[PDB]
Design a protein around this ligand. Structure first.
Ligand SMILES: CC[C@@H](C)C1=NCCS1
Ligand SMILES: [Cl-]
Length: 152
């Protein structure tokens, strides 16, 4: 991975978790990326989220950990994540582990450089989720939800 090439604007496409409530409509992880800015030791993210039906912004900075390719950020507990796959110019797939109260769950996300991705890429992401124990029923196609596109 050449992490500088993930810089810029992205859209949240598919959102998946082995703890489904976290990504349901009022869940803390139901967030919609707008950009990723690559810094020397970190990644700076801007997201939107819906709070009581209203779009709202979330800004996070994730720092490199001592494990190559891994980043950490505090948000509803302690999160670590990695980049599983990307072609830089169309898609990126993230894998995240949240810890809170000594309990963990996984989050996987598919972002696109455009507001949608084709079925081939989506199905490949679904299979990768299943490879992590994230079942098909726990993958949400955010293009059929409020992603706060109007707020971008
Ligand atoms: C808490 C933010 C979370 C949704 C992230 N996903 C990919 C990088 S940060
Ligand atoms: Cl929308």
């Amino acid at each position: 991975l050449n992490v500088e090439k993930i810089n810029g604007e992205w859209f949240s496409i598919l959102l998946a978790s082995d703890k489904r409530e976290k990504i349901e409509e009022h869940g803390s992880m139901r967030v919609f990326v707008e950009h990723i800015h690559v810094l020397e030791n970190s990644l700076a993210f801007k997201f939107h989220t819906v709070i009581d039906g209203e779009c709202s912004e979330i800004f996070l900075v994730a720092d490199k950990t001592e494990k190559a390719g891994e980043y950490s950020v505090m948000y509803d507990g302690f999160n670590t994540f990695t980049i599983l796959k990307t072609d830089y110019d169309n898609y990126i797939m993230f894998h995240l582990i949240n810890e809170k109260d000594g309990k963990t769950f996984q989050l996987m996300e598919l972002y696109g450089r455009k507001a949608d991705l084709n079925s081939d890429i989506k199905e490949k992401f679904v299979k990768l989720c299943e490879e992590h124990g994230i079942i098909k029923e726990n993958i949400i196609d955010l293009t059929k939800t409020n992603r706060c596109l109007k707020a971008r």
